[PDB]
Amino acid sequence: GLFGAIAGFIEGGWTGMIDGWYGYHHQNEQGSGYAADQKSTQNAINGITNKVNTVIEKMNIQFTAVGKEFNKLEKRMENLNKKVDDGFLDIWTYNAELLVLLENERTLDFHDSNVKNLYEKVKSQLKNNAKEIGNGCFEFYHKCDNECMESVRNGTYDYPKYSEESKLNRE
Amino acid sequence: PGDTICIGYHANNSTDTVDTVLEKNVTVTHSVNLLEDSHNGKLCRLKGIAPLQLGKCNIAGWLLGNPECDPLLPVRSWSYIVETPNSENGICYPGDFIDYEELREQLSSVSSFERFEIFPKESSWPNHNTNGVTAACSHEGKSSFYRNLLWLTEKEGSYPKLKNSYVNKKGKEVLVLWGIHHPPNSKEQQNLYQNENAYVSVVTSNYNRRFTPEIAERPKVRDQAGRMNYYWTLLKPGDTIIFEANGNLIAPMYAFALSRGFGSGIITSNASMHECNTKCQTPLGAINSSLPYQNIHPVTIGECPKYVRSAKLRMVTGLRNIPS
Ligand SMILES: *[C@@H]1O[C@H](CO[C@@H]2O[C@@H](C)[C@@H](O)[C@@H](O)[C@@H]2O)[C@@H](O[C@@H]2O[C@H](CO)[C@@H](O[C@@H]3O[C@H](CO[C@H]4O[C@H](CO)[C@@H](O)[C@H](O)[C@@H]4O)[C@@H](O)[C@H](O[C@H]4O[C@H](CO)[C@@H](O)[C@H](O)[C@@H]4O)[C@@H]3O)[C@H](O)[C@H]2NC(C)=O)[C@H](O[C@@H]2O[C@@H](C)[C@@H](O)[C@@H](O)[C@@H]2O)[C@H]1NC(C)=O
Ligand SMILES: *[C@@H]1O[C@H](CO)[C@@H](O[C@@H]2O[C@H](CO)[C@@H](O)[C@H](O)[C@H]2NC(C)=O)[C@H](O)[C@H]1NC(C)=O
Ligand SMILES: *[C@@H]1O[C@H](CO)[C@@H](O[C@@H]2O[C@H](CO)[C@@H](O)[C@H](O)[C@H]2NC(C)=O)[C@H](O)[C@H]1NC(C)=O
Numbered sequence: 001g002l003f004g005a006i007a008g009f010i011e012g013g014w015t016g017m018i019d020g021w022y023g024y025h026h027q028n029e030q031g032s033g034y035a036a037d038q039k040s041t042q043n044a045i046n047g048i049t050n051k052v053n054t055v056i057e058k059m060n061i062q063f064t065a066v067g068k069e070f071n072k073l074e075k076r077m078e079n080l081n082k083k084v085d086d087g088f089l090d091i092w093t094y095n096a097e098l099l100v101l102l103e104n105e106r107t108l109d110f111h112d113s114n115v116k117n118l119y120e121k122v123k124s125q126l127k128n129n130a131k132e133i134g135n136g137c138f139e140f141y142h143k144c145d146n147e148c149m150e151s152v153r154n155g156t157y158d159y160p161k162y163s164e165e166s167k168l169n170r171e
Numbered sequence: 172p173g174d175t176i177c178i179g180y181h182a183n184n185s186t187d188t189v190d191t192v193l194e195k196n197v198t199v200t201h202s203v204n205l206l207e208d209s210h211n212g213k214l215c216r217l218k219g220i221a222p223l224q225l226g227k228c229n230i231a232g233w234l235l236g237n238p239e240c241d242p243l244l245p246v247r248s249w250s251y252i253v254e255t256p257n258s259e260n261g262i263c264y265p266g267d268f269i270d271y272e273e274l275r276e277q278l279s280s281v282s283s284f285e286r287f288e289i290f291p292k293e294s295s296w297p298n299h300n301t302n303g304v305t306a307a308c309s310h311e312g313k314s315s316f317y318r319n320l321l322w323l324t325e326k327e328g329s330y331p332k333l334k335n336s337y338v339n340k341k342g343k344e345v346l347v348l349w350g351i352h353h354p355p356n357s358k359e360q361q362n363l364y365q366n367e368n369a370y371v372s373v374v375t376s377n378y379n380r381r382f383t384p385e386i387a388e389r390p391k392v393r394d395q396a397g398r399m400n401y402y403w404t405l406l407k408p409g410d411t412i413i414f415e416a417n418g419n420l421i422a423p424m425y426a427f428a429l430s431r432g433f434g435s436g437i438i439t440s441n442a443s444m445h446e447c448n449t450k451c452q453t454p455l456g457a458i459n460s461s462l463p464y465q466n467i468h469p470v471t472i473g474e475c476p477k478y479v480r481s482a483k484l485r486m487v488t489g490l491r492n493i494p495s
């Protein structure tokens with residue numbers, strides 16, 4: 001993927017995270033678990049709803065379109081009507097299949113970027129209070145209980161509150 | 172030996188696949204089908220109005236009143252017109268129907284009409300016989316004729332020059348049809364019309380045509396060496412149509428006061444009428460869909476998805492599905 005996260009340095013997805021597209025797995029002394037990041041999931045849902053609805057809006061509505069009849073001395077006109085019908089059909093088939101191919105490629109890159117942005121957001125909160133151990137995981141240099149975990153998940157992690165304990169463990 | 176938080180993404184058991192430019196058949200967690208391929212296999216009303224089923228008849232037979240089409244006489248309004256592969260009863264006395272395809276095109280925007288007696292049988296032709304029939308237009312085994320036309324023949328050995336007119340006070344367009352008989356030999360000509368050099372003239376304010384019989388012995392068709400050509404014209408509100416003949420005129424008896432509509436048309440269909448209502452009718456069935464595309468049929472009545480040749484149009488909404 002273009003942004004290196006999905007099927008990249010985060011090798012796989014989580015069947016255990018059932019309630020959003022992107023999120024967190026935590027492990028501390030109180031235990032372990034999955035939580036979806038509600039905000040990044042919802043932003044992506046807003047974007048893709050709008051993308052689907054754009055395709056819908058741009059196609060509009062096909063009004064009544066029926067065959068036409070020509071007598072035996074109207075062959076040229078018959079063939080011209082058929083050339084018109086076939087021509088338009090070629091073009092709309094082409095536009096439809098291509099629009100979907102190209103938008104599918106962009107939709108997957110979009111998710112890849114969202115996951116990457118989420119990772120960088122956490123990394124930026126934690127600074128040197130945690131170690132990047134790859135596969136998208138951080139190893140805290142301090143005890144991070146459920147309340148601390150939640151503060152990471154919702155963007156209020158208190159870096160100075162734990163810097164000293166972290167510096168010592170990082171030695 | 173340390174607490175961890177990891178960033179990750181959703182996986183599930185979806186087997187949905189989509190195509191992309193760089194890669195085909197990517198399995199994704201969620202997706203949405205954009206291509207409608209489902210129809211109810213029936214003919215339906217459009218906005219509560221039933222279509223006009225010609226059945227074994229075609230437009231020609233319907234509007235001339237081919238006796239096989241008698242069940243269509245009372246029908247006055249429709250949402251669309253359905254011909255079938257067996258729509259074979261048209262002209263029953265052989266001949267040419269002039270500008271027939273134009274006439275069908277005109278009926279495609281008609282949504283209802285009024286069948287009315289433009290030239291009543293018992294009072295328009297006091298000096299002519301209004302009784303000609305033919306075995307080519309049999310009904311129930313007896314020779315008969317179109318329910319909307321009238322064969323005028325000699326009465327007591329003379330075919331006096333006739334001149335009748337009608338004035339369109341219907342306040343709508345009036346479709347008028349008539350016919351021109353061409354006997355196969357001079358004997359039949361004189362026997363039916365008593366004037367071997369006959370002619371017919373039809374004139375409105377914007378229509379002007381004159382007809383001359385062409386008498387010759389032609390290959391028999393429905394057991395007739397004679398011919399009958401059929402003609403029509405639209406009479407504008409307030410305009411006057413005038414017929415004038417000393418022979419060979421197949422006169423109008425019934426005509427149609429038309430009312431125009433939008434989104435009608437003629438289709439050919441195998442399918443059976445049903446007690447259903449639809450916004451979108453194809454010849455194969457009715458579509459009930461919000462999807463933007465369909466590969467069901469290029470011919471559509473109503474408000475339909477766009478026809479495409481595609482077998483598959485699936486848009487990914489979720490992610491690459493990578494269950495671990
Ligand atoms: C992804 O997984 C889904 C579920 O996961 C799996 O389900 C089973 C098979 C086990 O392997 C689990 O370990 C695993 O989690 C699949 O959807 C599931 O499909 C099965 C069909 O076999 C379906 O079972 C039916 O359930 C209904 C409703 O009963 C309720 O059950 C749960 C529990 O309360 C509830 O959450 C549901 O919403 C329902 O309210 C039941 O009426 C059915 O019984 C009828 O049919 C059986 C024969 O199958 C017959 O003997 C009965 O007498 C009766 O007529 C039947 O038991 C599961 O409910 C369903 N799971 C969910 C959450 O809906 C999914 O497969 C797809 O499932 C269907 C939705 C359908 O589209 C299938 O064609 C799909 O294969 C799977 N996805 C894929 C792509 O494989
Ligand atoms: C973000 O997470 C923090 C940490 O849990 C939340 O702050 C605490 O929220 C709980 C509510 O269950 C309170 O009991 C604590 O007293 C709060 N601590 C402080 C210092 O306020 C915070 O509310 C969360 N924000 C959102 C929007 O969920
Ligand atoms: C067309 O399909 C839709 C669903 O595929 C049918 O849904 C109905 O929609 C109306 C208005 O949105 C609702 O009030 C009904 O509750 C829906 N029906 C059901 C069973 O939930 C709709 O009726 C279909 N139309 C036809 C003519 O078949």
Ligand SMILES: *[C@@H]1O[C@H](CO)[C@@H](O)[C@H](O)[C@H]1NC(C)=O
Pocket residue numbers: 441
């Ligand atoms: C009409 O129906 C038959 C099946 O009864 C089908 O095979 C045939 O293709 C249909 N006609 C057309 C023109 O599609």
